[PDB]
Amino acid sequence: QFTERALTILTLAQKLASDHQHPQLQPIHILAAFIETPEDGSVPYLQNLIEKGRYDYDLFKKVVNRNLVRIPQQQPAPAEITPSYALGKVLQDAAKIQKQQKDSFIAQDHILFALFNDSSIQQIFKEAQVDIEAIKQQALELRGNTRIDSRGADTEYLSKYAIDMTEQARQGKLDPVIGREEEIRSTIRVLARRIKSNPCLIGEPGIGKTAIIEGVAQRIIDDDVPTILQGAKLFSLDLAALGDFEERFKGVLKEIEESKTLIVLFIDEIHMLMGNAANILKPALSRGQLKVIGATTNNEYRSIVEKDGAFERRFQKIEVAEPSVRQTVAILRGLQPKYEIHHGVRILDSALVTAAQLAKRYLPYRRLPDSALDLVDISCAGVAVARDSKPSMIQNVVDSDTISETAARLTGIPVKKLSESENEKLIHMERDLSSEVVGQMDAIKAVSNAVRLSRSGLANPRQPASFLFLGLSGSGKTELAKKVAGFLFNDEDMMIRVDCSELSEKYAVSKLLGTTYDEGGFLTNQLQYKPYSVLLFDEVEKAHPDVLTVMLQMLDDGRITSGQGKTIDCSNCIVIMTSNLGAEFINSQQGSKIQESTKNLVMGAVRQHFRPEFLNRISSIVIFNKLSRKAIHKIVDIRLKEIEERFEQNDKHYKLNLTQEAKDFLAKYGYSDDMGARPLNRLIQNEILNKLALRILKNEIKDKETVNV
Amino acid sequence: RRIKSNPCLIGEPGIGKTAIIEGVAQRIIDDDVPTILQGAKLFSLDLAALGDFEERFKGVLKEIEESKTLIVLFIDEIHMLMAANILKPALSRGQLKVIGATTNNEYRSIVEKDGAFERRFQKIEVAEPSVRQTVAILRGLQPKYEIHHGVRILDSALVTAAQLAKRYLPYRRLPDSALDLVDISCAGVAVARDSKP
Amino acid sequence: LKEIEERFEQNDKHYKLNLTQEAKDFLAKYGYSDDMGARPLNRLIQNEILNKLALRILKNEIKDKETVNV
Ligand SMILES: Nc1ncnc2c1ncn2[C@@H]1O[C@H](COP(=O)(O)OP(=O)(O)OP(=O)(O)O)[C@@H](O)[C@H]1O
Ligand SMILES: Nc1ncnc2c1ncn2[C@@H]1O[C@H](COP(=O)(O)OP(=O)(O)OP(=O)(O)O)[C@@H](O)[C@H]1O
Ligand SMILES: Nc1ncnc2c1ncn2[C@@H]1O[C@H](COP(=O)(O)OP(=O)(O)OP(=O)(O)O)[C@@H](O)[C@H]1O
């Protein structure tokens, strides 16, 4: 049978003679049918074995329809009714070159091939089809083995799913990477390994991977590529193949294996045991040939590369990281011109630098190039959305709104996102938290100090903020942090909550595990979710050798392995420990005894329950000794500030009066010895609230009123 | 051995267990192969299974039986319940010299059950080769992989490689890791060579 | 001093360090404890010496790459 691809033309050639309803099928017909248009999508134009063999079809595009319009017109049924064995031989005559060029069926060349006599301009000036001269010539150029089956695609499956940068690179489409140079170099090195050509990326994507692969191919097109693979080039797959599929995917593989290291493929995350398939090219890469390039993320890697280990033996992973904050500045400087000229605008460095500078911090997820630029275009958008919408004079993007607004366009509290020198939070936080919490100047000092140390990087950049805090319940410990992060992270929720009393034995499981049940996670599940965080650990003497040991890393390095195994940075985060041990020994501050004394009195107790090294891990440890009823009542209006916060504000507009009496009554009844003022909240929750709450609809209070009990 | 022709190569993979089979395959064309073993040659099935697609692997048992033990088979780390069980009905026909191999792992699993299919199998465990082993292959393959990479090396390095390599190798079979580090060393500065300075 | 310079003067700041036995006796004397040795002094230095700079860092009256002993 004829090749479908051939027959696709052939019937379309029968269709060709049908459209003008030709009387007969005659040599010069399909010269039009071979060609939809001059596109190499019609190979008989340029990619034809003749244009390369003998007769170029460019102007020779001219004459084909000239005949088929000058054929004597016919009617529908006699159209394509005849093979007209003069042409009808081409049916058989196409089987002649399948001999000398070694083919079986009758292909696009063959249907073409047979035509080489009269299908033409045959004259004194003959623009025609040379007989053996173009094809056997270029039927090796084309192909070199053509024959497979009537079925199949064009008779170059490459350009289907092979998308090449070097094209775009020599085109200059893509954006030059920054700083991945040695990373490129590293890979390229690996790319020079006969054992593992395969470099492999791990990390979080959006990170420059195929751009790395650009710099890769960039080094090809500028011949920064060293000798071996200079002749080689780049490809990268399209998953776009969508009959069955992998078989197709197999096609190029042979082809590229035939292609003889003049190109290289690039795949990104998708390296797959297919669910319902198997290993394709996994053998053909196991074929010990065919330079290829890998990448993925962690457990994906864990999954596939280990379940073989010859993937391991084929793949050498080189894991890039989210770059040092300053890098993207360059790629920003790279893309500064870009999107502003996309968005018809300008950029100030002030925001430009700032973008990452913050989005590093307060953006949870994305990548130094990514996350920043994400802001940018979006920042770029609104300002242009303003400009290209009406309130322009802004063209450059200046820090504040372009950042903080746009930042707060994620979050809020921009003025903080605006103001902080990141140092200033040091200097004034004491008084700041002093406004939040009274006394415990130690905590005021040390925690600040410690965190004043936690940044400025005086010690290991990987190293946590290690806090065991003590006192009574209701002592503002939780608040402290909640303030701290609230101060620091502009939020409380960085706080993360594990009572050490929760789980006695296996919690190591319940934080994380290589999961069999499968736990999505716990700790990191929050913290890997929340990279800037605070860690509350509670009754740590009831933290068990289960957990307190993995505290060691948790006390180390501020970077924590996962159950899936990944290490997760806590050095950006805080950790908080508490105990009831010397809450007795707080009976010292009952007599207001020397705390350092009773510290020692307490210190042993925790020192008893734990390992000094585990303790020497701690930046510092502090007790809350109970503090003045002054301090107690000093809480109150403050405790009431957080009352009125919304209340007189976003609804009531309720002016507020207070009887020192009740305030004292509160100051009397608000503080509990054991419980601190933790009642006071719930206290105020009642009489203050409800009498207020009651009078509300009772309308003696209206807006702007003030009545205390 | 007429009694147990089938070996079981035991050991952790990456050690050269089919590099064994390499020179073995060579001894076939080197013609040191014993009279018992002369007429046979090397087949080694690297199993790609891709209606049952396996019975192919079973149908070939006749194709070698066609040749009538005119070859040998070698399977490397795949020794497991197949379809059903791997191999034997041709071997269990009494026929079919095969080169068996495994880690103790796959040795710990199915062949623990019967043990009388290992009735064909002497289990031989490879040990991570000595320094000269690495050295000598390096000695042989230093010029190889420097010409594979089109470069040159100091044999001074070459032996010195194995030294710390063997010393501080946390994991692998040294020559690999060596050849790795070698190729690493090779390609690394070769890539540094082929790419300007 | 090593584990000081390892970070400031090495892996981050490139900030020089100087001391005197004046301050070091103002340390080691207190810095040494009988049973635990100077293991106290390590976690001692952690602020009043360290954070004295973490103070001075943004207090900045004198800057990085300098050194001033107390
Ligand atoms: N060095 C870089 N040069 C150019 N673009 C970069 C670079 N680093 C990151 N990018 C940008 O961030 C993304 C990273 O692209 P690339 O694929 O190369 O890395 P990636 O991690 O694979 O991104 P993706 O996750 O979509 O695969 C792209 O949007 C790219 O424009
Ligand atoms: N010095 C203080 N300054 C401000 N608020 C304080 C102070 N001491 C205690 N509080 C208040 O005490 C309450 C509870 O404090 P604390 O952190 O001790 O509770 P906790 O840590 O959650 O354990 P629990 O709440 O059960 O006592 C909060 O309302 C907090 O504001
Ligand atoms: N002594 C040697 N001489 C030459 N090449 C060797 C030698 N040992 C190992 N090799 C090389 O090691 C590679 C393959 O090693 P080989 O597969 O034999 O290790 P392996 O332990 O058998 O792994 P597996 O157990 O899965 O079969 C080849 O490139 C081969 O040339």
UniProtKB/Swiss-Prot annotation, chain A:
Modified residues (Phosphoserine): S197, S286, S392
CDD domains: AAA, RecA-like_ClpB_Hsp104-like
A GO BP entry: trehalose metabolic process
Renumbered residue ranges of the record's region Repeat 1: 2-71
Activity regulation text: Inhibited by micromolar concentrations of guanidinium chloride. Inhibits the ATPase activity, but does not dissociate the hexameric protein.
Region described as NBD1: 158-391
Main location: cytoplasm
Annotated residues for binding of ATP 1: G203, E204, P205, G206, I207, G208, K209, T210
Clp R domain ranges (all copies): 1-145
Motif Nuclear localization signal positions after renumbering to this chain: 625-641
Locations listed in the record: Cytoplasm; Nucleus
Expression triggers: By heat stress dependent on the heat shock transcription factor HSF1 and the general stress transcription factors MSN2 and MSN4. Expressed at a higher level in respiring cells than in fermenting cells. Expressed in stationary phase cells and spores (at protein level).
Keywords from the UniProt entry: Acetylation, ATP-binding, Chaperone, Coiled coil, Cytoplasm, Isopeptide bond, Nucleotide-binding, Nucleus, Phosphoprotein, Repeat, Stress response, Ubl conjugation
Crosslink site: Glycyl lysine isopeptide (Lys-Gly) (interchain with G-Cter in ubiquitin): K477
InterPro entries associated with the record: AAA+_ATPase (IPR003593), ATPase_AAA_core (IPR003959), Clp_ATPase_C (IPR019489), Clp_N_dom_sf (IPR036628), Clp_R_dom (IPR004176), ClpA/B (IPR001270), ClpA/B_CS1 (IPR018368), ClpA/B_CS2 (IPR028299)
Cellular component GO terms held in the UniProt record: cytoplasm; cytosol; nuclear periphery; nucleus; TRC complex
Entries under PANTHER family matching the protein: ATP-DEPENDENT CLP PROTEASE (PTHR11638), HEAT SHOCK PROTEIN 104 (PTHR11638:SF18)
General remark: Present with 32800 molecules/cell in log phase SD medium.
Function: Required, in concert with Hsp40 (YDJ1) and Hsp70 (SSA1) and small Hsps (HSP26), for the dissociation, resolubilization and refolding of aggregates of damaged proteins after heat or other environmental stresses. Extracts proteins from aggregates by unfolding and threading them in an ATP-dependent process through the axial channel of the protein hexamer, after which they can be refolded by components of the Hsp70/Hsp40 chaperone system. Substrate binding is ATP-dependent, and release of bound polypeptide is triggered by ATP hydrolysis.
Domain notes for this protein: Has 2 AAA ATPase type nucleotide-binding domains (NBDs) per monomer, a low-affinity, high-turnover site (NBD1) and a high-affinity site (NBD2) with a 300-fold slower rate of hydrolysis. There is allosteric regulation between the 2 sites. ATP binding to NBD1 triggers binding of polypeptides and stimulates ATP hydrolysis at NBD2. Nucleotide binding to NBD2 is crucial for oligomerization. The C-terminal extension is involved in oligomerization.
Quaternary organization: Homohexamer, forming a ring with a central pore. The hexamer is stabilized by high protein concentrations and by ADP or ATP. Oligomerization influences ATP hydrolysis activity at NBD2. Interacts with YDJ1. Interacts (via C-terminal DDLD tetrapeptide) with CNS1, CPR7 and STI1 (via TPR repeats); under respiratory growth conditions.
Family of this protein: Belongs to the ClpA/ClpB family.
Protein name stated in the entry: Heat shock protein 104
Biological source species: Saccharomyces cerevisiae (strain ATCC 204508 / S288c) (Baker's yeast)
Gene that encodes the chain: HSP104
